[PDB]
Curated annotation (Swiss-Prot), chain A:
Domain notes: The NLS binding sites are mainly involved in recognition of simple or bipartite NLS motifs. Structurally located within in a helical surface groove they contain several conserved Trp and Asn residues of the corresponding third helices (H3) of ARM repeats which mainly contribute to binding.
Organism: Saccharomyces cerevisiae (strain ATCC 204508 / S288c) (Baker's yeast)
Compartments (UniProt record): Cytoplasm, Perinuclear region
Outcome, altering residue 372 to V: In SRP1-54; temperature-sensitive mutant; reduced growth rate
Protein name: Importin subunit alpha
Full-protein interval shown: 88 to 510 of 542
Swiss-Prot record, chain B:
Family according to the record: Belongs to the peptidase C48 family.
Protein name (record): Ubiquitin-like-specific protease 1
Note: Present with 377 molecules/cell in log phase SD medium.
Gene (UniProt): ULP1
Entire protein: shown range: 154 to 172 of 621
Coiled-coil residue windows: none
Length: 418, 19
């Protein structure tokens, strides 16, 4: 029915133009394998682009943008056809119309184009889409805001390369309000967008802090939906990869009790990134390590270090190891860590873990040994390590091919097990 | 010191079909 659809689409009559356009939309609207290629091969894409022009019938603009939306929803080669037909400037132009139906269709299409690659993401930005897109969040229609939020997230997504910060940072005040939304779907993509923006340099992290986003993010960690918790925790986790001052902001927002709740999540990936987030907090100063302890975060971490899946165990190891670094300044930190039974789970990790985690682990063990040695000139810990079977593990680590694990395992054996 | 576990920069296409 395609050669007749094509001729009908090229008719000078206006209502059969619409009739054919609708028909093209329906066949392109198939969840699995829409006939995008045969539609493209009909050569109708430029004609559909013409129908989005200013002062075309509103219904015709809607149907054409919808058809082009689904062509752009396909492969990159198929999306390229839409882009090469100069559809993007018209998509953006449609955002300025007064029809919420047309505007949501246009912003949906831009979501597919921007979500294709960093090239098309930046291309959409280059066509100055940010200003009309930000204006969409003042709409009376939840679905329009919902779709615009997803498209906005795609404009912030990607680190290779990152989007122009001077452009995407303009969306920060909007996103700051959007995480106070009642719509769950809006909440999800808004948090994803923030996680992308906060996935970068400390200058980017600071900007997120400056618009007072962290406080509401922490609240969203206890949201009923894991679809909200996941990007929220990711965003929070990204922020605490910054310096101690930036991390303290998240702490003051009450992230530590929230992280305690996430450590018992049924979803493993939430438990892992909870461990990851905590680890980048125990990577801070003595007072921040102490705050983690005071939030009763160590006992579930120890158990996860003992029992959880491997890639969760790694992050739990990071957290306890980073916390042990505060033992030189405050020996009670180590004394508490040992008291909570962290020595054996650390020791058992030496035979299974990767060379980076092995080093993480050896770092933790030596810190425990240093404190135990000092707590005599004022080795129980070395005795606990031997009985945990750890003295043997560390000795075996002297046959490790990597330089820094060898000499570290060597010095541990030489200093505390001579 | 801080650390990221991801480090893997994957620009998977993020698209949605409207049906």
């Amino acid at each position: 029915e395609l050669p007749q659809m094509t001729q009908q689409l090229n008719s000078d009559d206006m209502q059969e133009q619409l009739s054919a356009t609708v028909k093209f939309r329906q066949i392109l609207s198939r969840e699995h394998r829409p006939p995008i290629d045969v539609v493209i091969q009909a050569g109708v894409v430029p004609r559909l682009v013409e129908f989005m022009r200013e002062n075309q019938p509103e219904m015709l603009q809607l149907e054409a943008a919808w058809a082009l939306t689904n062509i752009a929803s396909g492969t990159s080669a198929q999306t390229k056809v839409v882009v090469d037909a100069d559809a993007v400037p018209l998509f953006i132009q449609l955002l300025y119309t007064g029809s919420v139906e047309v505007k949501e269709q246009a912003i949906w299409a831009l979501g597919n184009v921007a979500g294709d690659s960093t090239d098309y993401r930046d291309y959409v930005l280059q066509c100055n889409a940010m200003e009309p897109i930000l204006g969409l969040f003042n709409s009376n229609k939840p679905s329009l805001i919902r779709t615009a939020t997803w498209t906005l997230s795609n404009l912030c997504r990607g680190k290779k390369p990152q989007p122009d910060w001077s452009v995407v940072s303009q969306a920060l005040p909007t996103l700051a309000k959007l995480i106070y939304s009642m719509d769950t779907e809006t909440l999800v993509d808004a948090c994803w967008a923030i996680s992308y923006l906060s996935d970068g340099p400390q200058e980017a992290i600071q900007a997120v802090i400056d618009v007072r986003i962290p406080k509401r993010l922490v609240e969203l960690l206890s949201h009923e939906s894991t679809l909200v918790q996941t990007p929220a925790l990711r965003a929070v986790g990204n922020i605490v990869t910054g310096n101690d001052l930036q991390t303290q902001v998240v702490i003051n927002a009450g992230v530590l009790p929230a992280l305690r709740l996430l450590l018992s999540s049924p979803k493993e990936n939430i438990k892992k990134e909870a461990c990851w987030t905590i680890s980048n907090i125990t990577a801070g100063n003595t007072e921040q390590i102490q705050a983690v302890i005071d939030a009763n975060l160590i006992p579930p971490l120890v158990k996860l270090l003992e029992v959880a899946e491997y890639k969760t165990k790694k992050e739990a190891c990071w957290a306890i190891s980073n916390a042990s670094s505060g033992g030189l300044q405050r020996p009670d930190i180590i004394r508490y860590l040992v008291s909570q039974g962290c020595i054996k789970p650390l020791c058992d990790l030496l035979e299974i873990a990767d060379n980076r985690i092995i080093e993480v682990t050896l770092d933790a063990l030596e810190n425990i040994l240093k404190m135990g040695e000092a707590d005599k000139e004022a080795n129980e810990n070395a005795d606990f390590i031997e009985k945990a079977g750890g003295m043997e593990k560390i000795f075996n680590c002297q046959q490790n091919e990597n330089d820094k694990i060898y000499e570290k395992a060597y010095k541990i054996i030489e200093t505390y097990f001579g | 010191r801080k650390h990221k576990f991801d480090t893997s920069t994957w620009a998977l296409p993020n698209k949605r079909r409207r049906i």
